[PDB]
Each structure stands twice: as C-alpha cells, then as structure tokens.
Design an enzyme around this catalytic site. Sequence first.
Site, PDB file in Angstrom:
ATOM      1  CB  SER C  50      -0.797  -0.049   1.139  1.00 56.80           C
ATOM      2  OG  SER C  50      -2.138  -1.023   1.111  1.00 56.80           O
ATOM      3  N   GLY C  90      -5.722  -1.589   3.581  1.00 56.87           N
ATOM      4  CA  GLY C  90      -7.043  -2.555   3.479  1.00 56.87           C
ATOM      5  C   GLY C  90      -7.830  -2.635   4.619  1.00 56.87           C
ATOM      6  CB  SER C  91      -6.978  -4.140   7.963  1.00 55.16           C
ATOM      7  OG  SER C  91      -5.861  -3.229   8.313  1.00 55.16           O
ATOM      8  CB  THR C  94      -1.880  -0.512   8.451  1.00 57.81           C
ATOM      9  OG1 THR C  94      -2.504  -1.393   7.453  1.00 57.81           O
ATOM     10  CG2 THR C  94      -0.289  -0.852   8.110  1.00 57.81           C
ATOM     11  CD  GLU C 155      -1.733  -4.863  -1.688  1.00 56.34           C
ATOM     12  OE1 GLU C 155      -1.035  -5.557  -2.508  1.00 56.34           O
ATOM     13  OE2 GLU C 155      -1.368  -4.982  -0.544  1.00 56.34           O
TER      14      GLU C 155
END
Lengths: 192, 188, 190, 190
Positions: C50, C90-91, C94, C155
Amino acid sequence: HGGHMSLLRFLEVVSEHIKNLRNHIDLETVGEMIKLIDSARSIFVIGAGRSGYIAKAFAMRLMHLGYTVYVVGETVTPRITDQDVLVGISGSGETTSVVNISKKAKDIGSKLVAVTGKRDSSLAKMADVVMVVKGKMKQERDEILSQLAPLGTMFELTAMIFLDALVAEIMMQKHLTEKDLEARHAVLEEGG
Amino acid sequence: HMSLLRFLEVVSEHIKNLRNHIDLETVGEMIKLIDSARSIFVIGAGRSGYIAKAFAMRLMHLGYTVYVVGETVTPRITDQDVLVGISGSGETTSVVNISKKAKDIGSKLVAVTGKRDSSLAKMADVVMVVKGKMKQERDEILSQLAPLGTMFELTAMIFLDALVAEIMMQKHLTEKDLEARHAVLEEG
Amino acid sequence: GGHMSLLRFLEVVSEHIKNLRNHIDLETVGEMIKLIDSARSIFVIGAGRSGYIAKAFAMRLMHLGYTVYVVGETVTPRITDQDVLVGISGSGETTSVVNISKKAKDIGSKLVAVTGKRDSSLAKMADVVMVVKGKMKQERDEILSQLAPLGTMFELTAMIFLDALVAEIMMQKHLTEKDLEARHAVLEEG
Amino acid sequence: GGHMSLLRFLEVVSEHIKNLRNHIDLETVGEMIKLIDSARSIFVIGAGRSGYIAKAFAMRLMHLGYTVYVVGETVTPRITDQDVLVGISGSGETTSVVNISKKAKDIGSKLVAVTGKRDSSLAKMADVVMVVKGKMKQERDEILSQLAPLGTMFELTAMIFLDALVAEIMMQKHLTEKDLEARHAVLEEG
C-alpha cells in the site's frame, strides 16, 4: 565568508568527538553486540530519517560480510522471529517509530541492540545490548553544539563512524579481506 | 578490539587531513551555486546515495527547494537547477549517466569526488575534491580497515555536514529554524 | 500450459473493477477532491505494497501541479494543519499507518482514509473515508484468498481508484497529458 | 457531481483487462515462470511508477519462497550469470532500466522484459519478452492519454498481470494464502 570559519570549527568538533569515542568506547559492549549479530538467525536494522540512512549503510556492509540482513520496512524483508536480532539506531532513544517497532519486535521475541546516545532511554530500556555512542559530550552545552551540529548531527556522524569501526573489527575476527566484500557488493548501478 | 580502535585512529588522521586541505575557494563556489539554483537535485549510488539523501534532507531544513534524483515527488530537472553528484571514483556509471543528461538539459553540476579529473569531475561546474584514500596511504592496511569506499564516504558525509554548519552561519540560522521544517511524523 | 489460474485472476479483477464503478460514492469522491485541492500540500502514507500505491498516487499528484510528499521520505517537511494526509490501508488497522495518522490529526491536518473497512480505526479518525473493498458481497472468501492473497484485491482496486481520481482531476483542471509531461522526472527515463 | 471521467476511466480499465485475458501469450508466460523457477536469485527493476510495480512483485515472490532482490536496494548482492533480471518498462526505452539490463546481460544473467513494445531496446535484449500492452488496437492515442496519461494503462495492466502470475505460481506450487502469511513482514502492519 572566504575563511569559512564555521566549516572549520565543525571539523574540529568532529575530531574531538572521534577522539572521545576512541577513549571512552565500552569494549565489553562492542563484544556483546558482535556476539548477538553473529548468533542471530538474521539481522534486521531500523532507524528513522538520517539514522535510517546510517542503518542502511550498516546493513549493506553486513551483507558484504556475508550475514543474512534486512532493513525494516523494505521490499524483501521477511517476518522477523524470536531467533533474530533487531539493531535500532536512535540518538535520543525516543524516536517514536523506532521505539514502536522495537517494542513489537521484543514482543515477538527478537533480541534488540540499541545504538543510542542515551543509556536510560525508552529504546535502551528494551534492549538486550545498549551500545552507547554519544552525540553531546559531558563537558559540552547542547545549545552551542547544536549551532554547528543541529538536530543530532553529531550523534549520526559518530554512530556512522562507530558502525564502520565495528565492520573493521568483524572483518579482522572473521579473517575477511576487501576482496571478500567486493565479491558480494552490488554492481549494476556502480559498474565496479 | 584492536582493529576497531585502529580504524578510529585512521579516521582521526583523515579528518585532521581534511581540516588542513579543504579548498576554501571551491567551498565558496559550491555554496554560490546551491544558493543560485531554483531547485537542487542530489544523487549518489549505493552508500553514497545515503549520503546524498542525508545532505538533501539537511538542505530542506536549511530552507532550500531540494529533491533526490529517482525519488517519488522529484519533478523535471531544468536549466535553472543544480545537480550535486556524489561519487568517490567519479566513474560511478549511474551517476555519470544521470549527470551527463542533466548537463545536456543545461543544469549546473557540482561533483563531490575523490578524483579531480574523473569523468564526473570533467563535466562539473564545481569540482569539490574530497578524498578517501590519501596520497601515500598503505593501500593494504587501509583497504582492510576501510574496505570499498568507506573512507571516502565518511569523509564526504563529514564534509557535507561541515558545509551545513557554514551555510547556517552565513544565513544566521539556529537549530530552532531547522526544527521548524523537519518532519515529525516518524521521529516524534 | 493452460494457466487457468492466471486467466481466472484476470476475470476476477474485471468483476471487481465493475463492482467499484457500480457502487462508488460520488459525493465522497467530491469531498476527497475538495480536500486535495484546498490543501497547502498533500502527504501520503501506506505500509508495504500500500506504500507503493501511495507513492504512485503522490507522483501523479505532483504531475497535476500539487505540492506533495511521501511520509518518511527524504525531503518531506513538517506536516501542518494546512495539509491533508492520505492514508491507504486495506484493513484500516495497519499499526504504523494508524499511529502516523493519529499524530497528523493531533497536529490538525485533514485525513483521507482509503480502506476496505468503514468501521476501522483509520476510517473512524478520518475526515473523508473512501471505501474500496477487497472481497465482494457474493464472492466466496476462500476463492478470493487463494487467487489474491494478503489483500491483493484491495490493493489493485485502490490503485485503479486512485488513477481514476487522477483522470477526474485532470478533466476538472482542463489538463492534458502534455501538461503532466512538463512536470515529470526525466533523468531515469530519458 | 457525476464524475464522468472517473467512471469512464474505470470502464476503460476493465476493457483493457479483458483484452489482456484474451490476448496474453501463454507460451511466454510459461517461459517466464520457468526462468523464475530455475534462477538462483531473481532481481527486479523499474524506473518511477514501474519501479513501484517491480517492488510489489518482488515482495510477493519473497512471500512465495524465492530468493529475490530489487536492483539498487540496500541488501541486494552482486548479480550473477545464474540469476534472472525482470525489467519493467512500458516503452522498453527507459534509459536507466536499459542501461542496468545491458550490464546484467554482460554478466550473463537472464532477462525478462515486461513491456508494451515487443521491438523496443529492452525487448531486443531479453530472453523472454512478456508483452503487456497499454494501448489497444482501435484506441486513439489522444483519447487514452487524457484518461490514462504517461503510460498509466501499461502500469495498471502490468501490475494486474504480475499479480495474476503470482496466482498461477501459487497454484503450480500448491501454495495457499497461509503459506505466504508465514513469510510476510509484520513489524509495520501489526
């Protein structure tokens, strides 16, 4: 202007700091640091900003010496484990990103070497080996030093010189020569 | 740890030598070029690239508009700009190739190098000579303590930080002025 | 060599891009553009892959004429309350990105989160949340994870979204490719 | 408010990925996989945005269990005639990448060119020319470049191709997401 007096004064200060390092370095601690580097499965290095550039310079030399080594956050760095060692470089020992990463590494069970000017810092308190490399000396005022060597410059130069000295020592111990390092160094962007 | 301490002794000797021999006229020319540039670009390969980045970061703290060649936000170099190339041998392939392209565009070039008539130096507007291996140094002992470019790299790093001290003086800056500009997200 | 998994992956990507286009919140897109366009400078951050997406997007913002930086990189200056930070995760959990983003918010910067998780730590602290999904509603997780492990699909979808955003900003600013060519780096490319 | 250029870009990307799924040379894919598997180590390179794609792919190859490096990075060792270099360049003319690839070929490494131009400088040097095109046959350059400037479409297509290639290698090697999870870095993610 033409005499560049501050340039020359800075170099005098660097001379004094290298002499200080020669006369005060803890040789027992150097041995402990070498022992952890040698006994680890693999070595991971980290610093923020300019200390990150020092960490990269050191990691590259460890690679030249034949160690399995990585820089935290970089592309091909794999999972750190409880058989590895992390070397964190931070003048204050308070650098937020380096402290946070080192705590996570300690929780995983990796060992930690702190290269720092502050034996009592957050980073040092977590470390298995605290390798003290001062920026400011006992007899120096920080305000005066920082006018020539701002933002921890003196720690960074001294730490770089120390890490290159450590490489010299490891080469001696392992009977490695320049030609041995040359065989491992990257050539694509430099051309040898 | 004799080799550790002998290395420190060699570095000591080398810094004394730098102190005695730095070409002060060339320092002034380098500072003039840096000050006259619209933007400053820096480049080095390998460990010299890390030196280049350390110097670029400090130039940013000193208030310059500065970039590292190849990095994400680096814009198109122009004939209003200056490139600073760091190469011990002055023959580093990537640095020579990039510097030639910069000269073709019309940028000015400062070479920080150990060889005054190297390919890189011959292209440069200012040749800032910083030597690693000294004149008559025993190549065998020096290579063993300070392999590859080690001495040049340490000397160049020390010289560029000395240049920063000089520029701070010339601009009447203090540490607090640099602290106003430095990145805090990772450091704290 | 039928390479059926390679081909299947490509089919899945196409379905995900169609899903993104079909469901994108155009109002949130406008709010993201407004923050970028009013900031003194734009800072970007992501960890690992990312991070590479963040750098790609930053480079394009520079081409569009913005003042832009990547968190942690050499010439990045002090972030301020005049700036916007774009964080990609994404989550949305991070840890490095959450910690940096919270520091930015404490300084007073604005924050755009590009994430798959609208209730995540990163999303809840953000001024604008661009929700870009990995797994789709009727998509079997086990299949997606075998073809697109470790958040690959988030991603790719985030990268495609950010290039679509660039296309939009170009149109709004009446820029063509030639305008971007004036600003792009040439020393490594020729 | 409608963000028409954003939406059109997404439509165009999905068409390009369908185009890829139907035009990709599976023989060349198999040759690329064979070199990756036979090499002692894999080295990757790209300039600018293509360098970010190269890093994303190298990271995944590391997760798969390969010994892999990014050219120019800290721990990358001397390349040898037993290694393969993967160079990513849309035009195949990227000077830095061509120059590095020439040096690798002099050392005797194998070379995979991931490029849109099969008769480019980079392609001509390569052992495997993995053609991944940015522009389609019937597309007008001036139209594509407005939505997707400076090789954007090549870059997205190349990134998606390399992730598809990873899906294929996982299948051939009987690897699952959990196998990759074992190897991935965790310090900056949590």
